[PDB]
Each structure stands twice: as C-alpha cells, then as structure tokens.
Amino acid sequence: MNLQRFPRYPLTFGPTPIQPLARLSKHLGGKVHLYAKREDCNSGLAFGGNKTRKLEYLIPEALAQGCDTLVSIGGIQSNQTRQVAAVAAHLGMKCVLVQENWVNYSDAVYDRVGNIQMSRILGADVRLVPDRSWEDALESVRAAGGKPYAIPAGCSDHPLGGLGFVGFAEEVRAQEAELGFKFDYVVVCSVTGSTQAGMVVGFAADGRADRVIGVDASAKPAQTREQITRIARQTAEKVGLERDIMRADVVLDERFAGPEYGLPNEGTLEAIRLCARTEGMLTDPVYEGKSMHGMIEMVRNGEFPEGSRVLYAHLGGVPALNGYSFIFRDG
Template sequence: IGGIQSNHTRMVAAVAAKLGLACVLVQENWVDYSDAVYDRVGNIMMSRLMGADVRLVDQGFDIGFRRSWEEALEDVHKRGGKPYAIPAGASDHELGGLGYVGFAEEVRRQEADLGFKFDYIVVCAVTGSTQAGMVVGFAADGRANRVIGIDASATPEQTRAQILRIARRTADMVGLEAGIADSDVVLDTRYAYPAYG
C-alpha cells in the first residue's frame, strides 16, 4: 500500500516480479495533484509494466491500516491466494525496522575511514521504519537521539508513535538491552504542513 507515485510499492512490484510472485498494490491518492496523467506515469507505470495488479483508491494520506488494505487481502484470499501483507513503507510490519539497523554500522565504518563522527543523521519520516531502524542501530553507541526525523506526513503524533512502536519492537528483535526511550525518537515537525509530501 502506498501513494500513487510510491517508491516503496514500485520496489515491492519489482521484487515480486523477480521472484515470480503475484503482486497486488493498493495505491491511494496521498497528494493533491491534479495532473491528468499522474496515475499513469512514473512509479505506477513501472509497477504495471512489472505485472502488478494496481488498484487505485480515492483515499487521502494515512499511515494506518485502512479498509482498502483489508479489501485487497480479502480479495487475494477469495481467489485462493495466500497474501503476504506489506504495509505502507514496509513500516508497521514485524520486520519493518530491521532494514536500517545495519545502516548505523555502515555509517560507523565510514566515520572510521573519514576520521570523524557525524553529529546528526537527518532522515525524512513518514511511515517510520527508516528512522526507527536508524534509532535502534545508533542506540548501540549512545546516539539514538542524534537521528533527526523530518516529518513529511503532516500527522506528527501518529508518525512519532509509529516510529517509537517500530523502534521498540526492532530493539527487542535485535536484543538491544537498553531499549528505546521516548526521548530517543526526535521528530522535527516544522516542514510538513499543511499536508503530506
């Protein structure tokens, strides 16, 4: 699930095509953009070319689970399929935060090669898994709160709560003994308004 021009859903379509799996994408109208071909070009066109069943849904932005998500899963079940459900941004998923935990180790190696440490890591935050994984990865050397998320969701309370939930679940999965404190999730809300994007 994602917006009409979602990079995430395009990558899901690519992986499914590579593995020979059927792919159903729920593409919601997350941005107020009225170009006549917006839903036929770019990422959505690539997803279709890779064989994805693209379903356009006239719903605005929301990082939560919605009826369109449930309907897609029900439809796959009705057709005898076994869906592997991936939420927006692969975020609020049991494995959603793992992808960027290793990012911190990669940055530490680069810092060692460069001979200095970055003061902050700044990342765009919408569905939360990227920042959550980074927070967990940098918690190992006490820099969890040096990962600054720039809110692009325009729903900062929901986004912050999701980042924290994903980070805590991920910390448990990787055995981070110190855990993740509320103060470890830093979300700058000055730039997103009035809407997602």
C-alpha cells in the same frame, strides 16, 4: 545486539555510498560538513531506495511461509508500492497493490507517470480506490488460491520493518571506521516510521539515537513521532538493544512537512533546486525535498554546531517528480 540472527535477502548492490556535499556545504558557509548516504542508489530493481533495504528482511519470512504474492499499499505516487512491484517480479512473485488518493493533488498524469507507471509495467495489479480495499486485495489472492504476504504501508508497521535500517547504522559505523571519524548527525525523512525507527535503534547502540534528526513529511507529527517511538522500542527488543528507547531518543522536526502530506511548500522547491544545482543530486517534492529543506534550514540557522558532520540519508523518491511537472516547467 545481533541483527545477523535474521536472514536478509539480497535486493541491493551492497553497502550504500557516502558522498560529500562540498558545494552545498560551502554554499551554506562551510560551518557544517554535509554528506549523503545514497539509499536511492542501492538497487537495480526499478531504482530501489529505502523501502528496498527494509524489504531484504521481510522477504525471507514471505518465502519461508510459502507466500506467492506480495500485496502492499500506498498513495498514487507511492515509492513503496513501486519497489514491492519490482522486488516481487524479481522474486518470481505476483503483486497486488492498493493505491489510494492520499494527496490533495490533481494533476493530469498523476496516475500514469513515475512510480505507478513502473508498477504497471512491472506487471503488478494496480488497484485504484473508488474516487475495505486492503482485505478485498488479500482475499482475491486467497480466492485465486494464492497466498499473500501482507506488506503494510512503507513496510513500517510490521515486526521486521525496523531491521533494514538497524543495519543502516551498522553500515555507517563500518564506513566511519575507514573514515577515521563518526558523523555528528543523520538527517532522515519520516512518514510511516520504520526507517527512522531502525536508525534510532541502530545508533542507540553507540548512544547517538538522538543524533538522528528526523524530518516529518506526514504533516501529522504526533502520529508519525509516536509510530517511530513505538516501532523503535519493538525493534530494539527484536535485536537486543542493551538499552531502552526513551521519548528523548526519537527526534522529529516538524517545521518542514507543510502544507500537507504530498504537497511541497516554497522552501521544499527551493531546497530541491538548491541541492540539485550544487550537487547534481535530485530530491522529490513529497519526501526527500522536505528533509533536504530541513537540513539546509538547520544549517542556515546555525542549529548545527560549527564543525559538525551531518549525514543526509537520501531515501529515493525521485521518480515522483514526474507527477509534479507543472511546478518545474521552467525548472
């Protein structure tokens, strides 16, 4: 296949480093070698993260089409909108964000710290629903004579949204080369879908598509899984996957998404603390903390073949921790 056919606008530092999680792994019995690829450290634009990798392939079309405003949407503590706001500012574009109440969480500063605080500082017009927002948004832009580039939730349901992470697999291969070995697995957090989509496609190439263990954080596994499966197939087409994406290539564990999207369970919190305390690597209570929780449990349940080398994709999400201050008041 050839991803190179599509331009890629530089929004990151370059390939993302892979680090070993020796302590955590040892702490879990050293039967599985845990690593982490730091998408959460990929950019100077308000901490970047997975979405910013996706955005590298969307911005050319946006620029190509002469759009002057980037418009997107997500929950109050959405990492996506924050990155869009930063990318927009860096690209000299306006930005309109529609933030809705996607989480049944009521915290005094939920709408004033973390991701959303940055978006406002970055100059985005941050529109908070009551309590069609999307179309009003696009229109107000047109109305103001601007031209909006619509970026759907997480950049996922878009023709280009699966690309970024195809190249992710492509990166892991280059690093594996210098590494003298290939990872047996890839643990990734899944919600809107195009991150795991790209990976499924990217690793399908060398037949590891089913080695990408997605961990659902949506709490709506069915939809999420179907969106990954769907987004993959389409992306595979878009790149030239000399193979087809089977409903067996899309893996999605559903044991760690509870209780609801945006709410952590006690395993989520323990996982965040375990990992932060052994590696000095933080994960959040909405996304990464759930995928981390997933891996620690998989490992702990011997679900991973001794000697296995698992690559944990850390997608970002850390700033959202500020929206859950009470839970971590004593750590």
